[PDB]
């Protein structure tokens, strides 16, 4: 018989299976559509989640009750020091889909990125790319490099840069192995893309070359793991009555007599968390550039000299010394987790997209307690 009352189903079938992600670094599953009229540029970046704080700003939005009034907003800090370009990858079209044409690597690769090619770096002879580097010394070897680049200009339809992070700049990460990813170039002609990506070899590309203030971006990462979980927390089903024999944290009926099988749509217990997620439309509130006034947490209204890092450091992270992004709201994953930042796939012709953010105050109180001072200088002057 039909169910007595209607309620919508718990959870989405569009994120199935709720398993552990097969990767740790978030993966771009689709780059923005290439517009060959625009200049050559990168479409993605890698960063690390430092922590959260809250800001105060005055809202300019006609028709809203918040118009000309200040609002408090939680922001996530993502430390994004510049990436190093170490290679180029070309793709050609094919009736089966895109296919890697060839790749060209730079002569100098740091040991941080070379650790990525080893399970046990310190037990090995560290021979990776040692003979490849010899093409840049002879003259027949340089001929191959130029021939590979010319093949890229003639046959490729997609050109991507091979870039890695400078993971040793963040000492609190306690990691020497860099993160490596492919980033698409989305401007100009194929010859323009190849020339643009080749001039960047062994060079640092800052976050300001990819994103700007007040832009909506997509954040890709793996959420926080939680291990084996029951249906009440994993799927959000309701608890049974207190009187329930053999426990109350289950789904009561897991299916009818027919079909004589359990369906894939019924909530079951299993892994919760550590899933790949692509979250879009996160606004950039600030770009903190190392060696500039924009790096400090002082605003035009607050002239107090303070750093972005809260008192006592970012809990479980450390001190932010490199370039960073302030982003409205929450972000996937725990602290220290590597996050992939991608340009929006759609046109951002909206008021929230086109709004101009002006910060009034940045909180730098300690997040390890009920912090009440904005700086260590203020705390010491208070106690004498």
């Amino acid at each position: 018989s039909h169910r007595k009352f209607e309620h919508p189903r718990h959870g989405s079938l569009g994120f199935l299976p709720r398993k552990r992600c097969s990767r740790h670094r978030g993966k771009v599953k689709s780059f923005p559509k290439d517009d060959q009229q625009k200049p050559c540029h990168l479409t993605a970046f890698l960063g690390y989640k430092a922590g959260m704080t809250h800001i105060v700003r005055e809202v300019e939005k006609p028709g809203s009750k918040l118009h000309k009034k200040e609002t408090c907003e939680a922001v996530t800090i993502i430390e994004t020091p510049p990436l190093v370009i170490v290679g180029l990858v070309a793709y050609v079209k094919t009736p089966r889909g895109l296919r890697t044409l060839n790749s060209v690597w730079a002569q100098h690769l740091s040991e941080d990125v070379r650790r990525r090619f080893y399970k046990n770096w310190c037990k090995s002879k560290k021979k990776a790319f040692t003979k490849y580097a010899l093409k840049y010394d002879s003259d027949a070897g340089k001929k191959e490099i130029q021939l590979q680049l010319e093949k890229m200009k003639k046959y490729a339809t997609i050109v991507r840069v091979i870039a890695h992070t400078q993971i040793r700049k963040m000492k609190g990460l306690k990691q020497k192995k860099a993160h490596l990813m492919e980033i698409q170039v989305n401007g100009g002609t194929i010859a323009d893309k190849v020339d643009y990506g080749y001039k960047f070899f062994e060079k640092e590309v800052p976050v300001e070359a990819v994103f700007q203030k007040d832009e909506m971006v997509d954040i890709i990462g793996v959420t926080k793991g939680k291990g084996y979980e029951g249906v009440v927390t994993r799927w959000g089903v309701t608890r049974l009555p207190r009187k329930t024999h053999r426990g109350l944290r289950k789904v009561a009926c897991i299916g009818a007599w027919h079909p004589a099988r359990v369906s894939y749509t019924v909530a079951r217990a299993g892994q919760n968390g550590y899933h790949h997620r692509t979250e879009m439309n996160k606004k950039i509130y600030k770009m903190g550039k190392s060696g500039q006034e924009s790096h400090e947490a002082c605003t035009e209204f607050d002239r107090t000299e303070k750093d972005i890092t809260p008192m006592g450091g970012f809990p479980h992270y450390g001190v932010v010394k490199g370039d960073y992004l302030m982003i409205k709201g929450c972000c996937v994953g725990p602290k220290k987790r590597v996050v992939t930042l991608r340009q929006s796939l759609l046109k951002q012709t909206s008021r929230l997209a086109l709004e101009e953010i002006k910060l009034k105050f940045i909180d730098t109180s300690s997040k390890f307690g009920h912090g009440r001072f904005q700086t260590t200088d203020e705390k010491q002057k208070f106690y004498g």
């Binding site: 809250h54 800001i55 607050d302 009440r372 904005q374």
Partner: protein
Amino acid sequence: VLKTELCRFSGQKIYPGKGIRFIRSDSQVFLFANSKCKRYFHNRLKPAKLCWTAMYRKQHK
């Protein structure tokens, strides 16, 4: 920044984006710095008796 408030119970500074505001039945506004200063004043503890508050230090100095 400049628009900062004082705690009604402990007398310490409150920065924008924080604060617990309690309205008493007689239209009195009490702003509290955090959960400790709010639980006190609801347990009816007098701030002049707690050594760490501004009022106590004012009377004892």
